[PDB]
What we know:
This is part of a larger assembly, with one copy of chain A, two copies of chain B, two copies of chain D and one copy of chain F.
Chain A lengths: L14 E4 L4 E5 L1
Antiparallel strand pairs in A: 1-2
Chain D lengths: L23 E2 L2 E2 L2 H16 L6 E5 L6 H12 L5 E5 L10 H11 L1 E23 L11 E10 L2 E7 L1 H9 L6 E6 L5 E7 L13 E2 L7 E11 H9 L7 H6 L11 H16 L3 E5 L1 E5 L6 H10 L7 E6 L3 E3 L7 E3 L4 H4 L3 E4 L5 H14 L6 H13 L2 H5 L2 H9 L8 H10 L3 H9 L6
Parallel strand pairs in D: 3-14, 3-17, 4-13, 9-10, 13-14
Antiparallel strand pairs in D: 1-2, 5-6, 5-8, 5-11, 5-12, 6-7, 8-9, 15-16
Chain F lengths: L1 E6 L3 H13 L4 H10 L2 H13 L1 H4 L8 E2 L11 E3 L8 E3 L2 H8 L7 H11 L9 H11 L6 H5 L4 H6 L16 H8 L8 H4 L3 H8 L13 E2 L4 E3 L4 H11 L2 H6 L5 H8 L34 H4 L2 H16 L3 E5 L3 H13 L8 H7 L5 E5 L7 E4 L6 H10 L5 E7 L3 H4 L1
Parallel strand pairs in F: 1-10, 2-5, 4-6, 7-8, 7-9, 9-10
Helix pairs in contact in F: 1-3, 2-3
The site of one adenosine-5'-diphosphate has 16 residues of chain D, from strand 2 and helix 2.
Amino acid sequence: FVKPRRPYNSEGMTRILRRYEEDLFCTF
Amino acid sequence: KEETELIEGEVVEIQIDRSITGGHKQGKLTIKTTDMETIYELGNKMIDGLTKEKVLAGDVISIDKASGKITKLGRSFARSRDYDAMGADTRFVQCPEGELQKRKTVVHTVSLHEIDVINSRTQGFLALFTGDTGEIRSEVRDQINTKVAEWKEEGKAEIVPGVLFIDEVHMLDIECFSFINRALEDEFAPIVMMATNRGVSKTRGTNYKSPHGLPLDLLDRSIIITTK
Amino acid sequence: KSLSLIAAHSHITGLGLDENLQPRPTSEGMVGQLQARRAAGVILKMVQNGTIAGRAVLVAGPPSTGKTALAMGVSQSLGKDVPFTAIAGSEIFSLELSKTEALTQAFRKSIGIKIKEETELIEGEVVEIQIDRSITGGHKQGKLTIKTTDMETIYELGNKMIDGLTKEKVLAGDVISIDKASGKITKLGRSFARSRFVQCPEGELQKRKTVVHTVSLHEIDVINSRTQGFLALFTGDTGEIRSEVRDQINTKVAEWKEEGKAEIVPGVLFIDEVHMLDIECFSFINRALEDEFAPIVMMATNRGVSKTRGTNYKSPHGLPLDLLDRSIIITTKSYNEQEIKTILSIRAQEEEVELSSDALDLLTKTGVETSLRYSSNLISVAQQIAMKRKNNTVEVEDVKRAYLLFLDSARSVKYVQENESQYIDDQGNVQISIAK
Amino acid sequence: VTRTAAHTHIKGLGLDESGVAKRVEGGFVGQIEAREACGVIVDLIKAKKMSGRAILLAGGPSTGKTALALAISQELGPKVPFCPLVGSELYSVEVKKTETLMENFRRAIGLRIKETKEVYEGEVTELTPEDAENPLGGYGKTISHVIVGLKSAKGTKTLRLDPTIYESIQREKVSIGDVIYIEANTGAVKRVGRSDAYATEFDLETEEYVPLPKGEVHKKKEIVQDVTLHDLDVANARPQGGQDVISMMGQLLKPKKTEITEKLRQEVNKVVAKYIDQGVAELIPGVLFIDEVNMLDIEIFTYLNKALESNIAPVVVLASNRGMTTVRGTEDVISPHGVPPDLIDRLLIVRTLPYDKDEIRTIIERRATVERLQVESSALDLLATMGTETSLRYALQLLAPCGILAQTSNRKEIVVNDVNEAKLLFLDAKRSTKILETSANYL
Amino acid sequence: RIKETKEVYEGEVTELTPEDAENPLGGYGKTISHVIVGLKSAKGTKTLRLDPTIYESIQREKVSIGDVIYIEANTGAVKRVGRSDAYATEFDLETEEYVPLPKGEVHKKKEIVQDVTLHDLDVANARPQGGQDVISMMGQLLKPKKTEITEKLRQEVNKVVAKYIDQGVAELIPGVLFIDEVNMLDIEIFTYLNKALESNIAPVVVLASNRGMTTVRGTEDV
Amino acid sequence: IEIDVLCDLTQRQAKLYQVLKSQISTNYDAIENAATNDNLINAVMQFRKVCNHPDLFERADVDSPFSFTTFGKTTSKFTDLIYSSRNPIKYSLPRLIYEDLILPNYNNDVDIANKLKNVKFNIFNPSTNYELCLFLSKLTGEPSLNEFFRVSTTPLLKRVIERTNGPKNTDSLSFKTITQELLEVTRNAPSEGVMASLLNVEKHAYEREYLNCIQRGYHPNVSAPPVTIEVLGSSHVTNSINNELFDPLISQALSDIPAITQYNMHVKKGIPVEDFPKTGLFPEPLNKNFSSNISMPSMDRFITESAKLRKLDELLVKLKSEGHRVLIYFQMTKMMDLMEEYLTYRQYNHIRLDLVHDWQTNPEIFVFLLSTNLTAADTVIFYDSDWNPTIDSQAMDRATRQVTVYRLLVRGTIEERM
Ligand SMILES: Nc1ncnc2c1ncn2[C@@H]1O[C@H](COP(=O)(O)OP(=O)(O)O)[C@@H](O)[C@H]1O
Ligand SMILES: Nc1ncnc2c1ncn2[C@@H]1O[C@H](COP(=O)(O)OP(=O)(O)O)[C@@H](O)[C@H]1O
């Protein structure tokens, strides 16, 4: 059997995404 | 002796989540080699080392887990739509192939004094460079002696003794000699080399004359090399 | 309470005196020195009367004559709730206080203020506790049943009582003490209910109790100074407190005594080896003794005409003549054979050592011959040699074995004086090798 | 294989059950009366009834005084606290020498306490705070309560926390999925690591992975601790361990030595006496050893005269190699062994004697067999004549160059010629002095 | 002697528009795809495309339209030089730094030669860098007492300095330490001079004295 | 084939050995004579217990400093956990000193003298000393002339907590030094630049010597809270003490705000981020191991702390690689559940407590634990070995192939004489 991953909780938090074609920035 | 893991590959996607103030930092990193592609989880020091030395998608980085060191090796994607904010001229490197995670054993040497200064107080690594380590207590040195012997018994660490050289030893007080005569009998004591260019002169701190400027208790427990 | 193994002055429970201040030959662990004990009783009455201040006495004599024994007898005869400071001559040489500031702090630590206050208290055994919560939990209601051996009652609790009982969790059968005005609740223990262990309290639940406080002038001096708090009384970094707060404390204490809210209880400052102070400290001591809030100073020294510290001349007792001008001197004398054997018998009784008569006579002879402290050290070390052969009483052979094993001063000097080539001299010359 | 330095061939006094010393036992040769006196001192220390007892080890150099003190410490065992010291240790630039002496005196008294700890532990499942109705009123904090859900092996408890514990919990940087350790005595929180119930190969902080703790969440466990009185005085003078801001900032400050007042010592003694009276703590008095007691000043001796009269003082052992020597800090006081006569009366002097030729030979035999070296008989006789001619220590520390010169010739045995090369390469004090006298420009 | 090439982007701010993305993410607002910033200088005008992370630096340093800024190339990290002189008569009463419009083009490459000494590097590496801990700013607000700098920091400074000489970037310039009236020096300082003159990094030291046959201080017969 | 294995004493085992040697009054000849003959038996089981495993005489537990506290303990749907740690030392202060020296009333002049010395006669007051304020404003460059009066009248910790990086005008007597000019370049500078690498010696020494994976060696012995002051009958004393110990500004500065709470402030309440009580002032510790004084019992020290167990772990790898089935012979049951714990940690196939049937039918089981006919057994191991032939002979008689017996011995104890 495969062990599950750790839960990831990011609530009320910003986000910076850096992908191949575009870079995003989410702000509250 | 320390065990570490090396991670090298192209960066596919960096996700960084931060608080409104900016204290709590967490995120995920998707690194990729030719054969494998895994997604990791990041910490505060990881994000701090990712923000400085700016990493974008397509850059090739090397990751050392035990040291927390991030080195950028170059770029491989050659992104077309570049916003003209920097004058970066990163090198064109190849795709790393094979295993993503490689295990190696590294060896580094630390001094005993550095361990006492580190364990002395909260910010001892600052005092290691500023020299503000004022009169470290004896209980500290007892506990580092016990833990150093325990590290010897586990096979993790070993003691490499060295040489302490004291040039112009006759410029010392008699209390220094009285401390040296009893500090030479310890288990953790190096081999001490002293040099003197003085004959029968006055011993500092008292009012008699002695050979080489040293009292006879120190000269009793010393073998003497002469020069011509 | 006051843990201790065995002290060197542990047999001195006070000054053996009558109601007419006459010294008995053997009372309270003190024998001999009749005139010195009478003078110390007069000084004790001077302290207990409390109408005069700033008088310095001096105890001078040969070494091992019971000067520290006299000081311990006075300290035990004073009893509790009276300040008694005992310092040495080397203690005032500080790196972060001056000598005059350290002497000032030692002077003000020896006089105290007696204040009587009353505080209403509740102490009983907890029977049962109900905590009630609402639907939203915004309001907390509670009931507490508490009893003694004479009454039982139920109290309706407010919110802060509920938070004070939820914190430091109190269950049934618990004996607690509640202060209403401060909100501090302490658990005394557990009641004797099998179904630490403290018995159930008796009498009324709500007692008005009077506590008598004694606080020194140095404590009020530290608290009144705004630079450091009361934690400097334990850490020890007061750091040269200014004279202005001392003057305010003087005026406040004077007006408190005038109003009748507080009394002044003076005490004794004992300086041991007073000959090792500088002449600046002596000059400060001359002018610190005429203040209204000055304790009675006891000094002990054993030197003869020796050099005063910080000077280049010699003075009697190691003290200058102006300091000796304001002092009355009590002189102690050397002991006889009977007093030495009585001291050794008392030290035998305090060290749970059973001695034979011949062993006691041998100890008396070797104490008259060499030293009283040498015999008082040999008597405890002979018991282990006696216990190695598995018998209770210490015989002559154990004392002779201890005399052979452990040396005294004179035999050590005699052994050194014809073997001085093996010892390091004043010039640092020594011979290590056996031959040549 | 092992590491040795001028000692560790001594394993104790080596006495019998009646206190009689054997000739060769425990690495000791000779010094029979000194060893018997030291055994009586060991029995007196083990009696645990005496306070402020002082002995003195008087003799020449290289007679075995530090060896006898090491024998005392090895005979008493690791339970009794032994505090070695040199006379030059007391001169500190942060605090006066009197407070250093009293610090060592309180450091030489041990204590053994059995302590009950209230411990909450488990894996963090749910971490949810609640907000205040007015966060910018300034008075009161941002949150009101934090709900923490902990689970263990066969148990799950939900806790409602005041904010002050949650500041420590946040300072250890816990998350959901971590195993924590909360003690209720001081509010300290220990974070152990990630739980093993989740994936362990997707991290970058090289953290350990622990399983769930056994038992319930809420426990009471017994812990036996060994402390000294000086640890209590230091922990009360510089308070760290609470969750208030003074103890919170006490860790970040640079530590320094202050003058501990007598009120704190008396209150610590009262609390320790209350601990002993309940059958919780036991008292282990120890040994304080001072090397080179001639280096002490007259003020330190005068404070020792009053410190030995206290009711909690340990047994103090001094060593000195001086004849008629003026005391430091004075100009005319000539006294035996550099110790003033006011301290000699409170002392029991134990005298050490010089050695002989055969004792030197067998001492070189034990030092050669503890250094893993085999010598010949003729070289051993040469080294014994060396020890009688120059010094015992010079014969002792000439063994290693002889072994090196034997190993460099691809042999195992030490011969006469290696000892002769050790003569030719290394000198002693007398030959160097004779070179210095017949010299042009202080050669 | 350290030489460095700096790339800059300075001038008066013309426009400041955080461009939104084509597909915004749920649960958020104003998801920046890129930041458009227009510059204006003397005989030069250039609009720029920026990283979305530069918007936090814009909001932190309070940059508005009409301000003059100073953009480092690689690090980003904009900063407000001041306000342009054309807005000096905007309000009646205003406490605002007014500065001239900068000359030259918006983009330029300048080679800056900077001179520092090794003691400056030692005292700058010794003190802890700009952080958020109480200890650093508390020591900044207190009396700057000197400390005994260890030989380890000097060794690492010499190591990194030699590493940057061998790249051809830096150049080492020794100088003269001139001590006059050396008769006042104690013999311990003379012995430490004897130790310190054997170092690899040591400069030339010049001494002056006006005495004849006098005793060395700290000794009564030499 | 019969061989024996020698092991050397660990530090802990030598310490309990020395404690047992010094405790029983050094009758080691009698102990050796009693071992040679076989209440000295109760003495020698303690030596055998120490030589076997140190956790049997004294079990290892959580290493923590001694708590010098008097807190609210339990004398045994949520449970309340409230901080209630106090100090056993109580300082008692009468009410008269407090009410007549520290609190203002009608008959004292605390507030009058405080105002007189801090406001009316302050030399930074702009209502009386405007020339000095203008001079200092030219000197420093402060935009406000009340800055000096505000700086001089608030405490140092309050000053460093709320310090703001406000702008200063250029026309002043103070500008930037060379060191600060070098400093402001490397705030966010990346690596490989010459000026950044010349100013980052400390981090390079940090990551060169692997300091984020080193272990803590020292923890204090006693930890204590500050000394409690007790005044009977006054709530003002309790309020002042609670305000001093738990000041919300300093307590909020040394910790952080939760992120969802910050989202509730900024979005659901419209509070700007400049009005936040500022946080994150606690200095970050050297490792994650240096953040606490509590050391957990690790499952690595248990192997190394017993020499026989460490040698057995070293030896078991060869028998695992060669594919054997090993017998372990014991005498007691404390070592039985100790080896159950160790084998459940190592995840080895071992018997749960018929035995002969399971031994014969199932070959997957590795290690069989027995306490004082097995034809397919190849290796027998005597851990706590005893030299009486009447038990050893039936031990190898109870258990085709070549049979090797292993005996683990400890150097310098009763087993070397044995
Ligand atoms: N009159 C006495 N009664 C009881 N004990 C005495 C008396 N005189 C001296 N001693 C004892 O002699 C011992 C040493 O005397 P001490 O007072 O230290 O001498 P000094 O007066 O020189 O300090 C002390 O233990 C003390 O108890
Ligand atoms: N009785 C003895 N048996 C074996 N070795 C001894 C004996 N006495 C002294 N030694 C050795 O001689 C040396 C003397 O050193 P030490 O005792 O420190 O000097 P001192 O005798 O002046 O105190 C020690 O290294 C010790 O190993």
